[PDB]
Each structure stands twice: as structure tokens, then as C-alpha cells.
Amino acid sequence: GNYFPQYPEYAIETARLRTFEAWPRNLKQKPHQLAEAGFFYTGVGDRVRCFSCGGGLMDWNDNDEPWEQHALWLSQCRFVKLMKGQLYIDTVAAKPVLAEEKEES
């Protein structure tokens, strides 16, 4: 072995969805999408963490896609690799808008 989810308690997406109970209705990204992308709500602002890699994302923009942001900033994630595949992770990083996003900070 060697790999193990950073947050085993949130490996079940059904449990991840539950954390979005207090998710701001305000945000364009909906609980279903975020939970399916492997994220669970931190309960603070719009901060979410991935159960698998433990990476945290915040300050979501209107046109952000949970899977893309996941693959873009946390490309080594085992969950992203498992669900979306390596080709997708590579392609995401080549999209102009995302490439610039990653170069910015």
C-alpha cells in the first residue's frame, strides 16, 4: 500500500454532500458538483477540501468548474486521476484561461 485518503471520513460522496448543508446559496458551484469533484465543505466562507489529497480551494469564480480547478491546482490527486484520468489533467493545464490562472499565483 502507501496511498490513503487524507480524510477517510469523507471518502463516501454521500457524506461529502452532507457537509454542504450550510453552503452559501449565493455561489454558482452547487453542492452536487463540488461533492462529486471530491470536495467537502469546511464550513467557512467558500472553502472546500478534497477528501483524497487534502488540498483546499477557495474564492470560487462564477465560471469555475469544480473538476477543472481540482485538476489544475492539485494535479497529483489520486481521486482526480481515478475519476477523470491523466489525459484530462493534462488537457486542463493546457487551456489558456486555466494556464494563465495557474501562472498568476
Binding site: G56, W73, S105
Partner: peptide
């Protein structure tokens, strides 16, 4: 979105 935490 911005990654406030990236795995070490």
C-alpha cells in the same frame, strides 16, 4: 479559485 492549501 485559489488553492489556499496545496499538499506539501
Amino acid at each position: 479559485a485559489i488553492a489556499y492549501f496545496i499538499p506539501d
